[PDB]
Design a protein around this ligand. Structure first.
Ligand SMILES: *[C@@H]1O[C@H](CO)[C@@H](O[C@@H]2O[C@H](CO)[C@@H](O[C@@H]3O[C@H](CO)[C@@H](O)[C@H](O)[C@@H]3O)[C@H](O)[C@H]2NC(C)=O)[C@H](O)[C@H]1NC(C)=O
Ligand SMILES: *[C@@H]1O[C@H](CO)[C@@H](O[C@@H]2O[C@H](CO)[C@@H](O[C@@H]3O[C@H](CO)[C@@H](O)[C@H](O)[C@@H]3O)[C@H](O)[C@H]2NC(C)=O)[C@H](O)[C@H]1NC(C)=O
Ligand SMILES: *[C@@H]1O[C@H](CO)[C@@H](O[C@@H]2O[C@H](CO)[C@@H](O[C@@H]3O[C@H](CO)[C@@H](O)[C@H](O)[C@@H]3O)[C@H](O)[C@H]2NC(C)=O)[C@H](O)[C@H]1NC(C)=O
Ligand code: NAG
Lengths: 85, 48
């Protein structure tokens, strides 16, 4: 499955995608070279690709802090919208 | 809440039920038995 992470329509248009139960090597192979079910590929470039237990997280900067869950993701990961922003 | 390092509980004993740091999974002794007893399937690991 493919799920979209957003902090709100107008809080920001910035969003992150999750390929739950996927390895962070096929989504790079899911670049615009081969057109998978998703059509957009601008974020497929990455530069912030993060691999987690739940799957592959793209477009979301990875930090090394601890906070209360904002948006559940899975396998001990929650993402929020903080600062730069 | 973190348990105090000194286990002075008036003779009452909880070492087995309290976590032991040595365990890679910080689980009490009894908890480990429960994990082994359950023949879990479809763990959902990332695998590869
Ligand atoms: C969050 O903090 C941790 C550190 O507690 C970061 O892990 C690693 O921390 C070291 C030192 O800051 C980073 O420097 C590199 O360390 C490696 C160790 O093998 C060394 O070979 C390199 O020459 C360099 O000195 C390291 O890059 C950093 N990341 C690792 C090991 O993956 C952690 O990166 C931080 N999380 C972030 C920025 O998202
Ligand atoms: C609870 O009672 C005893 C006596 O004070 C202590 O807990 C005991 O800790 C040992 C671990 O050493 C447990 O088994 C023992 O293991 C060693 C190897 O490590 C082995 O050589 C011994 O023959 C023995 O099998 C023992 O089961 C355990 N007993 C209990 C009731 O936990 C501890 O000091 C006491 N804890 C508190 C809070 O009073
Ligand atoms: C996702 O895809 C990447 C790449 O396809 C996988 O990276 C692979 O990770 C394993 C280890 O986890 C590597 O195997 C290693 O081989 C050396 C000998 O060459 C051995 O000494 C090590 O103990 C280890 O077994 C492997 O080289 C590496 N690359 C590939 C193509 O497999 C990754 O495992 C996949 N899954 C995740 C969660 O990343
Ligand atoms: C638009 O902005 C306001 C901020 O107060 C809030 O209603 C929300 O962030 C947005 N409206 C939505 C998501 O319906």
């Amino acid at each position: 499955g493919v799920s979209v992470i957003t902090p709100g329509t107008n809080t920001s248009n910035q969003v992150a995608v999750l390929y739950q139960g996927v390895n962070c090597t096929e989504v790079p192979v899911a670049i615009h070279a081969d057109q998978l079910t998703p059509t957009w590929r601008v974020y497929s470039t990455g530069s912030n690709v993060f691999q987690t237990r739940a799957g592959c997280l793209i477009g979301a900067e990875h930090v090394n802090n601890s906070y209360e869950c904002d948006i559940p993701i899975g396998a001990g990961i929650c993402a929020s919208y903080q600062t730069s922003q | 809440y973190k348990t105090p390092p000194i286990k002075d509980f008036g003779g009452f004993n909880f070492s087995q039920i309290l976590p032991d740091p040595s365990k890679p999974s910080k689980r009490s002794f009894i908890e480990d038995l429960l994990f082994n007893k359950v023949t879990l399937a479809d763990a959902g690991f990332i695998k590869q």
